[PDB]
Design an enzyme around this catalytic site. Structure first.
Site, mmCIF file in Angstrom:
data_model
loop_
_atom_site.group_PDB
_atom_site.id
_atom_site.type_symbol
_atom_site.label_atom_id
_atom_site.label_comp_id
_atom_site.label_asym_id
_atom_site.label_seq_id
_atom_site.Cartn_x
_atom_site.Cartn_y
_atom_site.Cartn_z
ATOM 1 N NE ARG A 194 1.645 -0.910 -5.853
ATOM 2 C CZ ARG A 194 1.410 -1.822 -6.879
ATOM 3 N NH1 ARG A 194 -0.066 -2.124 -6.936
ATOM 4 N NH2 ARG A 194 2.165 -2.545 -7.151
ATOM 5 C CD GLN B 186 2.763 -6.014 -10.358
ATOM 6 O OE1 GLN B 186 2.334 -6.772 -9.457
ATOM 7 N NE2 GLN B 186 2.566 -4.561 -10.335
HETATM 8 N N1 LIG Z 1 -7.217 8.078 -8.263
HETATM 9 C C1 LIG Z 1 -7.537 6.804 -8.081
HETATM 10 N N2 LIG Z 1 -6.510 6.006 -7.756
HETATM 11 C C2 LIG Z 1 -6.632 4.514 -7.231
HETATM 12 C C3 LIG Z 1 -7.914 4.058 -7.546
HETATM 13 N N3 LIG Z 1 -7.980 2.620 -7.156
HETATM 14 C C4 LIG Z 1 -6.683 2.407 -6.850
HETATM 15 N N4 LIG Z 1 -5.873 3.526 -6.885
HETATM 16 C C5 LIG Z 1 -4.515 3.798 -6.680
HETATM 17 O O1 LIG Z 1 -3.885 2.966 -7.161
HETATM 18 C C6 LIG Z 1 -2.785 2.044 -6.710
HETATM 19 C C7 LIG Z 1 -2.845 0.692 -6.855
HETATM 20 O O2 LIG Z 1 -3.653 0.237 -6.002
HETATM 21 P P1 LIG Z 1 -3.690 -1.489 -5.695
HETATM 22 O O3 LIG Z 1 -4.957 -1.746 -5.030
HETATM 23 O O4 LIG Z 1 -2.754 -1.757 -4.735
HETATM 24 O O5 LIG Z 1 -3.644 -2.021 -7.220
HETATM 25 P P2 LIG Z 1 -3.462 -3.608 -7.339
HETATM 26 O O6 LIG Z 1 -2.155 -4.080 -7.792
HETATM 27 O O7 LIG Z 1 -4.642 -4.003 -8.611
HETATM 28 O O8 LIG Z 1 -3.803 -4.303 -5.894
HETATM 29 C C8 LIG Z 1 -2.685 2.762 -5.172
HETATM 30 O O9 LIG Z 1 -1.840 3.704 -4.852
HETATM 31 C C9 LIG Z 1 -4.116 3.407 -4.893
HETATM 32 O O10 LIG Z 1 -3.969 4.690 -4.432
HETATM 33 C C10 LIG Z 1 -9.061 4.885 -8.008
HETATM 34 O O11 LIG Z 1 -10.090 4.600 -8.269
HETATM 35 N N5 LIG Z 1 -8.729 6.191 -8.163
HETATM 36 F F1 ALF Z 2 0.121 -5.281 -5.949
HETATM 37 AL AL1 ALF Z 2 -0.896 -5.617 -7.250
HETATM 38 F F2 ALF Z 2 -2.121 -6.326 -8.977
HETATM 39 F F3 ALF Z 2 -2.138 -6.617 -6.175
HETATM 40 F F4 ALF Z 2 -0.062 -4.884 -8.398
#
Ligand SMILES: Nc1nc2c(ncn2[C@@H]2O[C@H](COP(=O)(O)OP(=O)(O)O)[C@@H](O)[C@H]2O)c(=O)[nH]1
Ligand code: ALF
Ligand SMILES: [Mg+2]
Length: 318
Positions: A150, A176
């Protein structure tokens, strides 16, 4: 005719995680530079999460299983990398003995079970669960470690691919409140929007404020995007994500508490699954053309290869 796709959704929904699955599947694999960066992240992920778990069971009063572990807890407290970066293998290995001991403590695992009482990216569990090969001295990250890692996206990132001789271009941006402000730059000439929803987060509160519900925010955002003139000639596809985590929560925690209008069986996956589709269906003014949607798990690579081949059709056929 290069198809431009835009990845949108609330913070910690899996946007970046998806974008990784695209590179794994359709892009060129990661050279040591990126690989090491993922490791720093993984190490960091493990150290910051524990710090929070160790402070969690304290601020919730939960007792230790073995009270000796206090001293292991101490070892993490003063760890910090806020606005910082490289965390080296030497650094981490010092913490491995502490991490393993704490994770074995039932007091801590119980603190992880009350996760939703605070803020912690549950991706912590997976790592501490197999700290044995992460905490090995010569460790390199696996694909699965990487996808589970992450990093908060504080910018924009175009990512180019050519899938079945068709040049795609996907943009990942941050979810965010602070980052949404950037979105309008990417709304130029987009052919589709892949809106994502951390569907396991009905019991969780949003990070950037103590009080707003995470899934309500997702719905709120979706409503504004889906009903926009600007996106009249744009395919909009919804990804109910974290389906594998959702399965777990459904069993123990009920959505009935958080969404009282829910009228089904609160501990049946499909009762809850269908309700979500409906809620997002309901935020649309033009409920004439159907709601393209999938239940994904963005950490599971096959699921995504499957799901994307479908999404490729939907989009191209429009
Ligand atoms: N268990 C599980 N974890 C997920 C899934 N998709 C994302 N994650 C976790 O959620 C966290 C956030 O992912 P990220 O792509 O950075 O979220 P974003 O802020 O929308 O980009 C990461 O630590 C991933 O491991 C999923 O389908 N299942
Ligand atoms: F790091 Al993100 F939505 F891309 F919390
Ligand atoms: Mg991101």
């Amino acid at each position: 005719r290069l198809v431009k796709i835009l990845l949108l959704g609330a913070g910690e929904s899996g946007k970046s995680t998806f974008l990784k699955q695209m590179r794994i599947i359709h892009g060129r694999e990661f050279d040591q530079k990126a690989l090491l960066e993922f490791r720093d992240t993984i190490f960091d992920n493990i150290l910051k999460g524990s710090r929070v778990l160790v402070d969690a069971r304290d601020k919730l009063g939960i007792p230790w299983q073995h009270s000796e572990n206090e001293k292991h807890g101490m070892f993490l407290m003063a760890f910090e990398n806020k606005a910082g970066l490289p965390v080296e293998p030497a650094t981490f290995q010092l913490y491995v003995p502490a991490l393993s001991a704490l994770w074995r403590d039932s007091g801590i695992r119980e603190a992880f079970s009350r996760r939703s009482e605070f803020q912690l990216g549950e991706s912590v569990k997976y790592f501490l669960d197999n700290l044995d090969r992460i905490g090995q001295l010569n460790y390199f990250p696996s694909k699965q470690d990487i996808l589970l890692a992450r990093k908060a996206t504080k910018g924009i990132v175009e990512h180019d691919f050519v899938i079945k001789k068709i040049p795609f271009k996907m943009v990942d941006v941050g979810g965010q409140r602070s980052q949404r402000q950037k979105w309008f730059q990417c709304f130029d000439g987009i052919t589709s929007i892949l809106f994502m929803v951390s569907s396991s987060e009905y019991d969780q509160v949003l990070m950037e404020d103590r009080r707003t519900n995470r899934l309500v925010e997702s719905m709120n955002i979706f409503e504004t995007i889906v009903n926009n003139k600007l996106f009249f000639n744009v395919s909009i596809i919804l990804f109910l994500n974290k389906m594998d985590l959702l399965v777990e929560k459904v069993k123990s925690v009920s959505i009935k508490k958080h969404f009282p209008d829910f009228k089904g069986d609160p501990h049946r996956l499909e009762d809850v699954q269908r309700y979500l589709v409906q809620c997002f269906d309901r935020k649309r003014r033009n409920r004439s053309k159907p709601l393209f949607h999938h239940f994904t798990t963005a950490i599971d690579t096959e699921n995504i290869r499957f799901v994307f081949h479908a999404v490729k059709d939907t989009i191209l056929q429009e």
